[PDB]
């Protein structure tokens, strides 16, 4: 499928941007704004951020499959969200260009109703959010210390942070070989109305970030998942995967072993029809499932990942496209699972982590 217009080299981390006029790839000329250019580029591609950045010299590094340079308008950069809008072709005489080490995500490092037991390392971003010893929600690692989950996982009775734990790196709930860390803060969306009024039926903005008290080490069993790239659309009909330890049947018990299930994305036109959810699928929400039912997420899966794989970055990567949010029962025909549309919260995520980088406690954020 069509490649993303912003790319990063796996060989030396050089940033490469597509020039639609030539159909070529160009390097980014080094400037005093390298730090932010690197950051924006990583965010644009679906990575959480740039860990570090550096300069490369074409005279010793080569062009490696590029034809020329792009220069960043450092006057327009501060007031833009899209890198492509502030770049123009330039000579870049000294031949120094930008390299950026974005935080790797979405790749395995190994050598739910109607789903099946999964195996270690297959979904290394999946975490279990437990309160006072009970698994209540899933979550997805965006880094070693930040987890994306659902805001509804934090009702009034589950807000004492010292009583929450994040279990990673294992698929069996009772495994003593995983890692379980504490929680420093929970940044929930201020637009999630039921947070202040549990009786509210308006579930839009069901999303929250969990900052662990310390970072988890990245291993073959613990890895962050990527985010949709800027402008990357959710494709109707595409089959993605949802995972979790939730009930294996609505009236059944939670899974002892993490479950995985494949479900296709359903269009809003169909899902908002009377036979389905009857105008209940609001903006920033989407359905995934089968008209026949049988395979779906369920209670205990909320906050968990709905991931789709793609190769737009020149290598297969899994991206967090939805967050398990709600549904009417579980696995019922014409009552698919409803998910928070992650792409609609990209900026909310990037800014929340920046604004509340070291905050503590429950924090609201619009």
């Amino acid at each position: 499928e069509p490649l993303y217009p912003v790319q990063v080299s796996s060989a030396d981390a050089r940033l490469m941007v597509f020039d639609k006029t030539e159909g070529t790839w160009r390097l980014l000329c080094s400037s005093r704004s390298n730090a932010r250019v690197a950051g924006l580029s990583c965010e644009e591609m679906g990575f959480l951020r740039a860990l570090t950045h550096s300069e490369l010299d074409v005279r010793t590094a080569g062009a490696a499959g590029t034809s020329g340079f792009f220069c960043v308008d450092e006057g327009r950069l501060p007031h833009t969200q899209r890198l492509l809008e502030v770049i123009s072709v330039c000579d870049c005489p000294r031949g120094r260009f930008l390299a950026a080490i974005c935080q790797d995500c979405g790749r395995r490092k190994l050598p739910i109703v109607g789903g099946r037991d999964t195996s270690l390392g297959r979904w290394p971003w999946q975490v279990s959010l437990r309160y006072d010893g009970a698994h209540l929600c899933g979550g997805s690692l965006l880094s070693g210390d930040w987890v994306l989950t659902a805001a509804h996982c934090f009702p009034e009775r589950n807000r004492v942070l010292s009583r929450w734990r994040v279990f990673a790196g294992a698929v069996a709930q009772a495994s003593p070989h995983g890692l379980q860390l504490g929680v420093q803060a929970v940044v929930y969306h201020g637009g999630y109305l039921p947070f202040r009024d549990p009786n509210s039926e308006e579930n839009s903005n069901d999303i929250a970030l969990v900052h662990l008290s310390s970072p988890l080490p990245l291993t073959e069993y613990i890895q962050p998942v990527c985010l949709p790239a800027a402008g990357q659309a959710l494709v109707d009909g595409k089959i993605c995967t949802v995972t979790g330890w939730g009930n294996t049947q609505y009236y059944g018990q939670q899974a002892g072993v993490l479950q995985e299930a494949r479900v296709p994305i359903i269009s809003n036109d169909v899902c908002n029809g009377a036979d389905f959810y009857g105008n209940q699928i609001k903006p920033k929400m989407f359905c995934a499932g089968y008209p026949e039912g049988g395979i779906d997420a369920c209670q205990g899966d909320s906050g968990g990942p709905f991931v789709c794989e793609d190769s737009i970055s020149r290598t297969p990567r899994w991206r967090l496209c939805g967050i398990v949010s709600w549904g009417t029962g579980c696995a019922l025909a014409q009552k698919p699972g409803v998910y928070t549309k992650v792409s609609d919260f990209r900026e909310w995520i990037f800014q929340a982590i920046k604004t509340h980088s070291e905050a503590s406690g429950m924090v609201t954020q619009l």
Binding site: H152, N203, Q280, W326
Partner: peptide, 4 residues
């Protein structure tokens, strides 16, 4: 319409 039940939350998960």
């Amino acid at each position: 319409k039940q939350l998960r």
